[PDB]
Amino acid sequence: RENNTSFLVNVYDLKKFDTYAFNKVFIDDYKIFWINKGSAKLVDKNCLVSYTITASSVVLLKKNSIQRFSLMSLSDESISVCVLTIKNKFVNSLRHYLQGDLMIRNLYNEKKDLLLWNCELNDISVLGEIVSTYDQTQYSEDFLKIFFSGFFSKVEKKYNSIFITDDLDAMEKISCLVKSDITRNWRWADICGELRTNRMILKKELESRGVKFRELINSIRISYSISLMATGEFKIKQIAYQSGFASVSYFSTVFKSTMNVAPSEYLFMLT
């Protein structure tokens, strides 16, 4: 299949009673995921908290976040996890179109990296309906453009929290810097220099997510390698080398230490 634009649709088969563990996976863009049928359990490993998501539940993973969570099937049916990615072009468009200004903002919900909402059952119907049609030339892109223009506007003023921030974030600068030269052997001095800062906002943004400097770079390269596997055709050796890993062994180790699957197994989950 071809690529996409402002919205990335990726559906995965949830093997009944299989655990989907994620250890420090980098979330490059905003992502929401929900199950089409059945039920499942969501376990966040950072905060010792569990959840029971249903077909009416939706989960948000914020951009530039380091996630440590797990998802486990609780249904006899091969559940169909739909993961939708929201790129920056819709983020800047959504942030402007909303002319509202919150008088009291729940800063706890703004600092959290894994939100959970139970949508109106009417919205779940519109959810899987438009997703099953994607995509058309700037035609299906506008169908989800209008849906999330009202869904996010509703949930933001309902919870009195900004869930999709605009730009200007220290993690966005580090991420786009490393991705501008993914194969470069980035060190600490290269990040501080081209960002015109020192280890005050730097180490804190690493300690706030519980990752070393090397751990962050590896997780950025994992998600970059995943975006290459999304095309459909690519040998693991090229994916490892074009993502910045010196050897296929260290790429497979970090990938399995991040996705809890072999890199070839994720290629089978796609096709």
Numbering used by the authors: 2 to 272
Paper text:
Toxigenic Vibrio cholerae causes disease by producing the primary virulence factors cholera toxin (CT) and the toxin coregulated pilus (TCP). Most AraC/XylS-family members, including ToxT and AraC, contain an N-terminal regulatory/dimerization domain and a C-terminal DNA-binding domain.
Crystals of ToxTENV256 K231A were produced in the same crystallization condition as wild-type ToxTENV256 and belonged to the same space group with a single monomer in each asymmetric unit. However, a subset of crystals was found to have slightly different unit cell dimensions. The first subset of ToxTENV256 K231A crystals, with the same unit cell dimensions as wild-type ToxTENV256, contained a UFA within the binding pocket, as obvious positive density in the shape of a UFA can be seen. Remarkably, no such density is seen in the structure of ToxTENV256 K231A solved using diffraction data from the second subset of crystals, leading to the conclusion that this subset of crystals contained apo ToxTENV256. Comparison of the apo ToxTENV256 structure with the structure of UFA-bound ToxTENV256 revealed conformational changes that occur upon the release of UFA. While no conformational differences in the DNA-binding domain are seen between the UFA-bound and apo structures, differences are seen in the regulatory domain. Amino acids Thr138, Gln139, Tyr140, and Ser141, that form part of the loop between helix α2 and helix α3 in the UFA-bound structure, form an additional turn of helix α3 in the apo structure. In apo ToxTENV256, helix α3 is more parallel with helix α2 and is in better alignment with the structure of the dimerization domain of AraC.
